[PDB]
Amino acid sequence: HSTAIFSDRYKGQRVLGKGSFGEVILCKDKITGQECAVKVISKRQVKQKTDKESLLREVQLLKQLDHPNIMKLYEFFEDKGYFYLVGEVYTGGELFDEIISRKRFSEVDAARIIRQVLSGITYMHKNKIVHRDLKPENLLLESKSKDANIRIIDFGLSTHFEASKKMKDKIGTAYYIAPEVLHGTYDEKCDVWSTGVILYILLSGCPPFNGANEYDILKKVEKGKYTFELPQWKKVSESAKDLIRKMLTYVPSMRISARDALDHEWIQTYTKDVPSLDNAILNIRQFQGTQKLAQAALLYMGSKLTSQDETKELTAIFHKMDKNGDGQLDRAELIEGYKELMRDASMLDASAVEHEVDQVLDAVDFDKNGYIEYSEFVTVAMDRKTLLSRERLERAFRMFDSDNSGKISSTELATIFGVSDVDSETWKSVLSEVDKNNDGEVDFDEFQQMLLKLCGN
Ligand SMILES: CCOc1ccc2cc(-c3nn(CC4CCNCC4)c4ncnc(N)c34)ccc2c1
């Protein structure tokens, strides 16, 4: 009897994106052609909280659960360096990204959204599974269809894996986390809190607990106080605010349960004219842009650091390989050395590496059947990734700059770097080095420059 190997069954199509605990890779069954979204959790980057026995049992259970608002899980694999969580793929993107793209959004729309969330949660709770880390990024739409269902992701991971302490992994988490979770004693009621935060945001476009940085947000959450004294709350029903109050009740025993929330007057009324919440849409669009850009900023810096690391490592690997030191390696050698390097969740296969080497070779017009200048290859393979990272950031800059002004203001930078948890006098210092004209604003290139300076370049 043999232990099942992931890559024997699945091939990687492409990267779907970055999630909690690992990279998510779109994959395809080598026989049946079934497409799946595979979260790949790196054992080196993420520590386990539970034992083997406890994990395997949870997986086994999760595979048998079924609910339209919960991500479907098909398979589980494990090897020396990784876990592989194989689930159903969803094509509709993040809930909030869909919402800002609309012209109209009412309490009716919000109620139908929250019912779906509460429904999925209620089910998982019945089965003694807690999310804990529930937020808008974990709410995916099933498809691109207007009336596509919401699929909750990452249920059950937090019980078994330790959360990353890295800011690039924590963006947005602080707004939604329940106070009891901070202090250590928590139960399924923490998920009702998070949903309550999400609802508050849906109807006002602002987080109830907010701050200049991660810790300030957490101070507010811990204190647990909030208000409906914003202007845009005047547009909202009393019942909506009543449910929010009940979900954002501090003491968890006093907090309304998920199942009881589904029976709340507000849910019952609005899910059976209602004005549009135009101000809420405005605020959510701004909120989302800011979050997405701070994320992009952190990923860019991370990619730059990774590249500096990998560039020198790859060169050192090939140098050792280049035994007579003439600078000439062949394709099979480049592959072996690239393999030794990756020893990219997307590259966890021999054929993946063969493919990627070939892509690099084709770009530089090097003949693949002869011998190659490895120094030249290295430059291209890394520049590709550097170029890719630059493009992702730019897109985020342009989206944030909704007025197409070409610029980001000093106030805006304060917000962005606050969310990125970059020290104030630190970024200001780097801004001072770049903005020698006292314009109090930066263009894309200047902004990029700052980020390079904030990662030791
Ligand atoms: C017991 C849990 O086992 C599993 C197994 C697979 C999982 C797959 C996904 C997943 N991630 N992404 C990438 C999106 C990029 C844009 N930002 C939002 C996410 C996805 N995109 C589409 N569909 C997906 N299913 C995912 C998330 C959690 C999973 C958990």
Instruction: Return the residue whose CA atom lies nearest to atom 27 of ligand 1.
Output: 153
228's CB contacts (< 8 A; 6+ apart) are 236, 241, 244
Inter-residue contact 38 to 10 (CB < 8 Å): yes
Q: Residue 24's closest CA among 137, 167, 174, 192? A: 137
In a 3-state reduction of DSSP, which class is residue 248? coil
Q: For the CA atoms of the chain, what is the radius of gyration? A: 24
* CB 94 less than 6 A from any atom of ligand 1: yes
111's CB contacts (< 8 A; 6+ apart) are 240, 266, 267, 269, 270, 271
Ligand 1 mean position, distance from CA 417 (Å)? 27
Inter-residue contact 202 to 240 (CB < 8 Å): no
* CB 46 less than 6 A from any atom of ligand 1: no
First to last CA, the chain: 53
Q: Residue 58's closest CA among 187, 181, 160? A: 160
The secondary element (H helix, E strand) that includes residue 329 is strand 328-330
DSSP track, 6-18: HHHHEEEEEEEEE
> 382 vs 84, 304, 305, 325, 456, CA distance in Å?
27, 10, 12, 22, 18
State the Cα–Cα distance between residues 430 and 449, nearest whole angstrom. Answer: 9
Ligand 1 mean position, distance from CA 24 (Å)? 6
Tell me how many helices (H) and strands (E) the chain has.
19, 11
Which of the residues are catalytic? 133
State the Cα–Cα distance between residues 208 and 108, nearest whole angstrom. Answer: 21
State the Cα–Cα distance between residues 195 and 134, nearest whole angstrom. Answer: 7
Strand partners, 29: 10
Peptide-bond breaks in the chain following residues (C–N over 2.5 A): 272, 343
198's CB contacts (< 8 A; 6+ apart) are 114, 117, 134, 135, 136, 139, 176
Q: Establish whether 42 is an annotated binding residue.
A: no
Residue 298 amino acid letter: L
Q: For a substitution probing ligand 1, which of 69, 140, 150 has the most ligand atoms within 8 Å of its CB? A: 140
Q: Where are the alpha helices (DSSP H) in 51-185?
A: 52-64, 95-100, 107-126, 167-170, 173-176, 179-183
Calculate ∠ Cα 400-404-410, nearest 5°: 60
> 350 vs 93, 172, 182, 332, CA distance in Å?
30, 36, 43, 11
Q: Residue 204's closest CA among 240, 238, 230, 225? A: 230
The secondary element (H helix, E strand) that includes residue 38 is strand 35-42
State the Cα–Cα distance between residues 131 and 191, nearest whole angstrom. Answer: 6
Q: Considering only the top CATH level, what class is 92-154+163-286? A: mainly alpha
Ligand 1 mean position, distance from CA 304 (Å)? 25
Q: For a substitution probing ligand 1, which of 54, 71, 94 has the most ligand atoms within 8 Å of its CB? A: 71
* CB 22 less than 6 A from any atom of ligand 1: no
In a 3-state reduction of DSSP, which class is residue 76? strand
> 417 vs 210, 303, 404, 420, 421, CA distance in Å?
14, 18, 21, 5, 6
* CB 121 less than 6 A from any atom of ligand 1: no
Q: How large is the angle between the packed helices 374-400 and 444-453, nearest 10 degrees?
A: 120
> 368 vs 306, 335, 363, CA distance in Å?
27, 12, 11
Q: For residue 456, how many other CB atoms are within 10 A of its CB?
A: 9
**Burial of 427: CB neighbours in 10 Å, binned 0-12, 13-18, 19+:** buried
Experimental method: X-ray
334's CB contacts (< 8 A; 6+ apart) are 318, 357, 361, 372, 374, 377
Q: Establish whether 53 is an annotated binding residue.
A: no
DSSP state of 231: G
Ligand 1 mean position, distance from CA 60 (Å)? 18
Q: What are the residue boundaries of the structural domains of the chain, listed by start?
A: 1-91+155-162, 92-154+163-286, 287-457
State the Cα–Cα distance between residues 380 and 383, nearest whole angstrom. Answer: 5
Q: Residue 381's closest CA among 338, 429, 443? A: 338
> 356 vs 300, 327, 425, CA distance in Å?
21, 21, 42
Q: Residue 298's closest CA among 123, 427, 187, 159? A: 427
* CA neighbours closer than 13 Å in the CB half-sphere of residue 109: 22
| Pick among 2.40.50.140, 2.30.40.10, 3.30.200.20, 3.40.50.1110: CATH of 1-91+155-162 | 3.30.200.20
**HEC profile for 396-445?**
HHHHHCCCCCCEEEHHHHHHHHHHCCCCHHHHHHHHHHHCCCCCCEEEHH
* CB 19 less than 6 A from any atom of ligand 1: yes
